[model samples]
Target: GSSGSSGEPEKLGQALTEVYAKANSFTVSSVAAPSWLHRFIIGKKGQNLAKITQQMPKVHIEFTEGEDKITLEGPTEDVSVAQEQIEGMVKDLINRSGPSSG
Candidate 1:
């Protein structure tokens, strides 16, 4: 059973810095990934997204239904952070997945 009363100090602090990104200048980036592998990027529950956003809520991460590119928008530093994280995730997933010739 899980209790709703979660008051972890560091957890709260992470969110505090998140909002400070408000109205910051914009920098957009995109990562190319196959549609099939895209599902893994957001993980099972969009937790990948939630985790990344918590670290860089300044950045916006978007995936349009028919687009092969993962678009990102935010301040340069944060956007890059998001971009790097997602790209690494996408790469790792794609890398080990080789076309089986069996």
Candidate 2:
């Protein structure tokens, strides 16, 4: 007979296992980009970033003030895909803007 006598222990074990699996699957990554690019990533009213996040709701994207870096956290696969998209955006912006005059 189970210790709980009502199978509550078994349910608790399953819930804990699910939580562990979710925790283990999460990942974090960062990309170095010009501070000027933050506006583009965030978009007017956050429309641009919202598109990506809508698809990967688990992902969180943060930009630091005065810092040329973008922080991303989510599931491993989603983080990887988001990283690639952001990097591509940066590359395109740089190409269009050309090199610094200084």
Candidate 3:
């Protein structure tokens, strides 16, 4: 019963643009994420990351190895939320060793 379709590029594009714009707001710049943390943010086994993008197919995650940067490109609101969530998770991990490990 979902109104959205994965095949629609227009919806994807709009969402992706939003995400990309929001990602730009982070102080870490999404480009400074460590490889291990980037993997965590992306998701374990990549399933979590895939789900995020599947819902917003137009959005893209770019990772720069060695630089620890993660770039998110997609819907503004969703991206904003995602960015906050991602940063929060990272912060939590650095602060409290993360939820799963703790």
For every candidate, C-alpha RMSD to the true structure in Å: 14.6, 19.9, 16.0
Total backbone clashes of candidate 1, pairs 3 or more residues apart or in separate chains: 0
| Residue-pair clashes per candidate | 0, 0, 15
Model 1 TM-score, all chains together? 0.67
Error of 3 at 37 (Å): 3.1
lDDT of each: 0.79, 0.78, 0.60
Please give, for residues 41-92, the per-residue lDDT of candidate 1 as tens digits: 7788879899988988888888866888889998877787788888788888
Give one digit per residue, the lDDT tens place, for model 2 in 45-98: 988788988887888888887777888998877887888888998898888777
Badly placed stretches (over 4 Å) of model 3 are: 1-31, 98-102
Candidate 2 overall Cα lDDT vs. reference? 0.78
Q: Best by lDDT, which number?
A: 1
Question: Model 2 reaches what TM-score against the true structure?
Answer: 0.66
Q: Each model's TM-score, in the order given?
A: 0.67, 0.66, 0.49
Worst 10 residues of 2 by lDDT: 11-20
Between prediction 1 and prediction 2, the one with superior TM-score is 1
TM-score of 3: 0.49
Model 3 lDDT tens row, 5-94: 454345334435422332444232253456766656666688866776677565566777776767877656566566665666667666
What are the runs in model 2 whose C-alpha is more than 4 Å off?
A: 1-23, 99-102
